[PDB]
């Protein structure tokens, strides 16, 4: 998988909206509770993501927030190719994993948005079986560093 | 400078609050307009940062948002050394870039992210070498061995 490829989508929990991005090659994720499932919030999130990593292509759903003029303008400005594919054709399974972790730690936080970030942390730091090997957070840095050469 | 060391501070622009984090060894930054200069918002930002990078130490000032029990608890939970005893120069640089592109966006928060992008992708003189975003990835990857 190319080091520049991400998948993005929204999932829902406690009547709130969570935007989730996955770096396909590594399994690293970033997620944010957003106030509304709008193009403005999606574009804001995409600009944050693009300033952090060398984002070349984002695969997204085809809902109005992802097809909005403001997401298109954000992608154009940041040099991101947006890909939609066949309508309703990694991200979904990641929604499920994220929600599982959130459930595991939900009582450890007072507000859902804090729990979301605790769950992202747990996901990105996790080593398979808890012993050695690499975490997703290490894999994304290794892949990107190697691509830079 | 150690790969795990960050500085965090708040700066102000257009009467709004911008939280700024700098990775000291690389010059890479993350920044966001926050609705209030509170411990809750600071802890949310710190937990985001900590989930992305191997954060070992954050240097902060001693204002009420950074000494709040919520920020202390976030650092404890994430295993981060919070030290109260580069970030200023970075506040100014960020503000300079924001000024350069401010008319390109409708809201300050979007302009802030455009400015972070410009900063993190910038090559010295615009020609070759590495950017701050490449430097942090190189430093961390190397530290992993």
TrEMBL record, chain A:
Source taxon at top rank: Viruses
Keyword Repressor: no
Subcellular location: Host cell membrane; Host cytoplasm; Host nucleus; Virion
An annotated GO BP: DNA recombination
Key words of the record: Aspartyl protease, Capsid protein, DNA integration, DNA recombination, DNA-binding, DNA-directed DNA polymerase, Endonuclease, Eukaryotic host gene expression shutoff by virus, Eukaryotic host translation shutoff by virus, Host cell membrane, Host cytoplasm, Host gene expression shutoff by virus, Host membrane, Host nucleus, Host-virus interaction, Hydrolase, Lipid-binding, Lipoprotein, Magnesium, Membrane, Metal-binding, Multifunctional enzyme, Myristate, Nuclease, Nucleotidyltransferase, Phosphoprotein, Protease, Repeat, RNA-binding, RNA-directed DNA polymerase, Transferase, Viral genome integration, Viral nucleoprotein, Viral penetration into host nucleus, Viral release from host cell, Virion, Virion maturation, Virus entry into host cell, Zinc, Zinc-finger
Alphabetized GO MF terms: aspartic-type endopeptidase activity; DNA binding; DNA-directed DNA polymerase activity; endonuclease activity; exoribonuclease H activity; lipid binding; RNA stem-loop binding; RNA-directed DNA polymerase activity
Main location: host cell
Cofactor needs: Mg(2+)
Bilayer topology: Lipid-anchor
Residues annotated as domain Integrase catalytic: 1-144
CC per GO annotation: host cell; host cell cytoplasm; host cell nucleus; host cell plasma membrane; viral nucleocapsid
Catalytic activity: 3'-end directed exonucleolytic cleavage of viral RNA-DNA hybrid; Endohydrolysis of RNA in RNA/DNA hybrids. Three different cleavage modes: 1. sequence-specific internal cleavage of RNA. Human immunodeficiency virus type 1 and Moloney murine leukemia virus enzymes prefer to cleave the RNA strand one nucleotide away from the RNA-DNA junction. 2. RNA 5'-end directed cleavage 13-19 nucleotides from the RNA end. 3. DNA 3'-end directed cleavage 15-20 nucleotides away from the primer terminus
Designated name of the protein: Gag-Pol polyprotein
Full-sequence portion shown in this chain: 56 to 209 of 288
